[PDB]
Amino acid sequence: LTPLAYKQFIPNVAEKTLGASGRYEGKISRNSERFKELTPNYNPDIIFKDEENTGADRLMTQRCKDKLNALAISVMNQWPGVKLRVTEGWDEDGHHSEESLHYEGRAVDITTSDRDRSKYGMLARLAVEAGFDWVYYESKAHIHCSVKAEN
Amino acid sequence: YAALIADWPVVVLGMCTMFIVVCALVGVLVPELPDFSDPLLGFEPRGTAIGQRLVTWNNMVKNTGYKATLANYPFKYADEQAKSHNFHKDSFFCDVPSDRYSRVVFTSSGGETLWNLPAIKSMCNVDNSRIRSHPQFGDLCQRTTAASCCPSWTLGNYIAILNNRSSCQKIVERDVSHTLKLLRTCAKHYDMAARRKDQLKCTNVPRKCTKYNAVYQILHYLVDKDFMTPKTADYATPALKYSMLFSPTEKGESMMNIYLDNFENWNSSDGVTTITGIEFGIKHSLFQDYLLMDTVYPAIAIVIVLLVMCVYTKSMFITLMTMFAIISSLIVSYFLYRVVFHFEFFPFMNLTALIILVGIGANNAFVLCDVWNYTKFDKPHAETSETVSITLQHAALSMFVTSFTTAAAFYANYVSNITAIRCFGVYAGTAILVNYVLMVTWLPAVVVLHERACQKCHKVLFAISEASRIFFEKVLPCIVIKFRYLWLFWFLALTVGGAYIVCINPKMKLPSLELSEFQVFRSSHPFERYDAEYKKLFMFERVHHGEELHMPITVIWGVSPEDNGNPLNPKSKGKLTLDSSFNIASPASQAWILHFCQKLRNQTFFYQTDEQDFTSCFIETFKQWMENQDCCCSHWSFPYKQEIFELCIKRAIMELERSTGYHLDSKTPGPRFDINDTIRAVVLEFQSTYLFTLAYEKMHQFYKEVDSWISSELSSAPEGLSNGWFVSNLEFYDLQDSLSDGTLIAMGLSVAVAFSVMLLTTWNIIISLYAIISIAGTIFVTVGSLVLLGWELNVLESVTISVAVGLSVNFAVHYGVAYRLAPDPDREGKVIFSLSRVGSAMAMAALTTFVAGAMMMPSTVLAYTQLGTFMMLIMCISWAFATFFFQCMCRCLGPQGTCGQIPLPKK
Ligand SMILES: CC(C)CCC[C@@H](C)[C@H]1CC[C@H]2[C@@H]3CC=C4C[C@@H](OC(=O)CCC(=O)O)CC[C@]4(C)[C@H]3CC[C@]12C
Ligand SMILES: CC(C)CCC[C@@H](C)[C@H]1CC[C@H]2[C@@H]3CC=C4C[C@@H](OC(=O)CCC(=O)O)CC[C@]4(C)[C@H]3CC[C@]12C
Ligand SMILES: CC(C)CCC[C@@H](C)[C@H]1CC[C@H]2[C@@H]3CC=C4C[C@@H](OC(=O)CCC(=O)O)CC[C@]4(C)[C@H]3CC[C@]12C
Ligand SMILES: CC(C)CCC[C@@H](C)[C@H]1CC[C@H]2[C@@H]3CC=C4C[C@@H](OC(=O)CCC(=O)O)CC[C@]4(C)[C@H]3CC[C@]12C
Ligand SMILES: CC(C)CCC[C@@H](C)[C@H]1CC[C@H]2[C@@H]3CC=C4C[C@@H](OC(=O)CCC(=O)O)CC[C@]4(C)[C@H]3CC[C@]12C
Ligand SMILES: CC(C)CCC[C@@H](C)[C@H]1CC[C@H]2[C@@H]3CC=C4C[C@@H](OC(=O)CCC(=O)O)CC[C@]4(C)[C@H]3CC[C@]12C
Ligand SMILES: CC(C)CCC[C@@H](C)[C@H]1CC[C@H]2[C@@H]3CC=C4C[C@@H](OC(=O)CCC(=O)O)CC[C@]4(C)[C@H]3CC[C@]12C
């Protein structure tokens, strides 16, 4: 229940590891084969970024989708009148670094509604609470949460 | 052929070699190399009217939802507008064990007292030395240190933690006895997979003295296999002779390098105990590697059969040349297979056909060379052209029939429904035919081309040849005539015993293990010694496997069962869905679907669990979600005018997802809509009460009664066509059924063609029926021996049944065609003459393949030793039976009653 500090990985080990994260497998396009694995969230209580207007965030991995919904409903309790903001769920234009998990869809960078500072630090530990795999304080601008995939 | 073969064999030899080399180059150039990725490459049947439905269902599950523009049947994603925009002391176990992680069970040595404390410490340390002492990516690494992330996941860790020590090996062993009593008292309790992250538990606690999240582990997942519920006595403390160890890592293709480099050469573990079960998930992976490597046993086979071919006829060069002829025939047959007919596959068994191929080859050359020597014996100072003509006239047709028999055998095996044997059949059949033609052309040439301290060895060769001669000259006739009833009675009794072991006693039975676990390696190999001897000794596995898995009823409407998959011999790849021409929207349509669910709510196989909300048919779900006013859609009839229907279906299901979305991952009752807004398929399911067996009969009763009912559709014109579609997970059922029916019908066609060619050769009904008796007795006793060795049917030992008949008639045909030199007695002299004439021929023609398969035996990949043993048995039996019997019965029958139509044919 602490405001997770700057640059703090909760699983205590780097992302590309079989502990809660595994490793990257393959790219995904709008027409790739494995793209079927992705689903839209469309939970109206959450506000999306959608700077690409193609739904780069509004869709994700169902395994990650359920966990994100869990975090949404759990932070609605501890913080009222908030609207969580996923800045980048799945990147295809490449706004992130290469071979990044965001390209896979097992990860999403999360911020609060009104762009608050200490709320990020607490929200990281909250993302831990909902049961997320590799929540890392990637940037001061966004909280980075990444999940393992099934199969 | 004979016209210009006279002293001009170089031309035909050269054109044959050119043919061979060009076909080899084409075969290695144009088609794509075979995969050998998975042995079970094509086991799933095709075109069997159920596998049709099954493959369509699977193809459908493939084209599932894609978040935006799924572009297939799945869902409603179009409406996205929505009118808006350890080394530690404790707490040391990161996760709980599961099937996902890799595992290894340990067996004790002669000490057999597994609760020995050095046994435990040795277990853990040898495990870590043999596994962890290698470059390892790691494990979950809950802490920062990636080394002692998950310590060995062993029971030693458990006893250490009950001792509450940061070090597993340090064990005074008193706590071992304490926890021994504890485990006894706990096995008394039946004691849950509690969370227990803290001491307090929501469920009732049988006893706090049971350490949280510890005893249930040893009792249910860990080394304990003997189920540890004896109620005998403290003195009766067993050893738990079987023990299991999970790997701190996880099972997957990656572990392949570790097992290969680090865990094969090791003869065993240690004198205290040793490995017996190595389940690392990586079985199909390294399979092909053992295949490649363990291929020198066929090399020993081919070289020893070449050697004995030399022994037979001293013309060593002829032996080498006919061997190369066999091999080249294999090659050109492969070329014809993959290329000429544009169909390609290679199901791992064609790399076993080669043995019986070279057997039949060497068979068909002996007869030719011996006929050549016979015709050279008389009138040797004659014309080479005439010699060729006469020896050909006397041997070629014999060769042709004695090969065309097995040719037709395999071209009959084609009729089955397994792909992984359709391909084998066609390939080996064209192979044997091309072998015959290449022999009948090539061999004459190379034969006629043979224009051409050692003394004592040559003398022993001469003497042993004369010994064989006299043995076949006096001994065998003496035996068969002097008994003339003993062998016949003995073989009647053996046929009886065979029919008995196949009929009522432990008999031929369908496969038992699950599809993906066909024992592919030698049963003594650890990987599969895991299965069939240990998997059924573990609480989690056993109590998980075959337990309360109610198979689901299921039905479709949107699609039609058309396997667009290269129907005739698919490549085990290639499928494509489609759409029907129905409309769910009609008022009578949804009314009928409702009434359908109603009727199905009255049946026997149903199981009214009464816990569902959204899993059964969604029409009643509408009904409940209806009467929702002021949105607007409410206050209507239970049927609808298709308009409220079309507007409300998407609206409502989207609102169900909006309330609390639950994943619908192409298994749910979720109706199917496409990229643009239209519902297309109406999948819905149920729950049966049959508990997912594996044996045939229960599944058959189930599927038969169920499809019997659902076939009665009697629906309205819309969605009334071929919509039956009832399909469970009964794939294994389909494999089994088609395997049985296929081996049956194939055996039938094989015996039919054998009897027909027996007619066409001997022209006597009587001796043909007698040969039929012969081959029937042979196949019966050999399959009886097989089942005595506990050999279920599979993709492999099915074709063996049918090929056995072809291999068997190969001797009866000779003993039948040999009814010449009609003596005064109707029986006496003719049979002894035939026997003395064909003795060495048949005996060597058998012993060759016998010794081939015999030296083949000790290997690792199952298929090899399987085929080796089968051929050894079938050849031994076919020879001995054929001779002894098919003369004994003939000794007591007069075959001078026949039917002749034209005397023109010769042989
Ligand atoms: C390499 C393979 C795949 C193709 C070629 C195989 C045969 C066509 C070759 C191999 C060995 C050759 C033989 C090697 C030696 C001789 C002996 C030679 O004898 C003489 O010239 C007779 C001399 C005399 O006695 O006066 C005649 C050619 C011949 C039969 C050769 C004919 C062609 C043969 C059979
Ligand atoms: C000795 C000859 C005259 C008769 C016996 C032939 C066999 C030894 C051949 C025939 C088919 C061959 C197989 C055909 C295809 C493959 C797949 C091929 O796959 C690869 O090359 C991928 C992996 C790698 O690069 O090693 C490896 C060899 C292998 C198993 C071959 C192993 C050797 C086999 C069994
Ligand atoms: C004509 C002489 C040379 C004897 C040939 C004997 C075999 C080599 C033949 C007999 C049956 C044949 C098969 C009969 C039918 C087919 C299906 C055919 O594919 C289709 O018909 C696909 C569906 C369609 O288009 O109708 C591909 C060849 C194949 C396997 C044939 C392969 C060659 C076979 C095994
Ligand atoms: C299904 C296919 C692949 C079978 C191919 C078999 C042919 C290679 C064989 C079968 C019948 C054979 C023929 C059977 C009988 C004769 C007659 C023979 O001459 C005589 O008998 C005439 C003198 C006399 O009467 O003694 C010369 C060989 C020849 C043409 C044989 C040549 C080789 C033939 C065509
Ligand atoms: C070499 C030939 C002459 C004999 C052996 C080949 C087949 C005739 C055998 C081998 C496997 C046997 C089958 C193995 C197991 C079963 C299941 C068994 O199931 C039942 O008893 C349920 C009721 C039913 O199947 O009708 C029925 C016999 C059957 C189909 C057997 C029928 C006879 C088969 C096909
Ligand atoms: C009296 C003379 C003329 C008999 C000549 C033939 C025998 C030497 C053959 C016939 C059947 C053979 C047996 C067939 C099968 C086997 C099983 C084989 O072991 C396995 O295949 C085990 C497989 C498994 O673990 O299931 C060991 C050899 C053995 C006993 C063979 C030993 C040699 C036998 C007795
Ligand atoms: C009269 C004999 C000496 C010669 C003529 C018969 C033999 C050539 C063959 C015919 C059938 C064979 C039998 C077929 C099957 C078996 C079962 C096989 O059983 C086992 O190895 C496993 C036994 C078990 O564990 O149940 C042992 C060899 C044996 C008796 C074989 C021994 C050799 C036999 C008698």
Ligand SMILES: *[C@@H]1O[C@H](CO)[C@@H](O)[C@H](O)[C@H]1NC(C)=O
């Ligand atoms: C060979 O196996 C035995 C167990 O049967 C084992 O004691 C011995 O150590 C092994 N050989 C070597 C060199 O380790």
Ligand SMILES: *[C@@H]1O[C@H](CO)[C@@H](O)[C@H](O)[C@H]1NC(C)=O
């Ligand atoms: C189903 O059967 C029960 C018992 O016979 C009966 O009460 C009920 O009305 C039936 N319902 C339908 C729809 O047939």
Ligand SMILES: *[C@@H]1O[C@H](CO)[C@@H](O)[C@H](O)[C@H]1NC(C)=O
């Ligand atoms: C689907 O319907 C839309 C109209 O909304 C049309 O533009 C599109 O071409 C249709 N696509 C297919 C594959 O029928």
Ligand SMILES: [Zn+2]
């Ligand atoms: Zn990120």
